[PDB]
């Protein structure tokens, strides 16, 4: 008599969503970049800085109040 096939197939990351998952990777294949980055942050080129998602929260703390 037959038997059940013994197949066998894998997941492979070959979607648009995987590619994101890289971003994650980036941020330490360059992390190192980053510190060196910072240092001439008074380049100009501060117009970037994470910490100004904390400032403009303070400035507008209405959001934070119930609304």
């Given at each position: 008599t ?66």
């Amino acid at each position: 008599t037959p038997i059940e096939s013994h197949q066998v197939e894998k997941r492979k990351c070959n979607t648009a969503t995987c590619a994101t998952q890289r971003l994650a990777n980036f941020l330490v294949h360059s992390s190192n970049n980053f510190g060196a980055i910072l240092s001439s942050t008074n380049v100009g080129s501060n117009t970037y800085g994470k910490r100004n998602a904390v400032e403009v929260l303070k400035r507008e703390p209405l959001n934070y109040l119930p609304l």
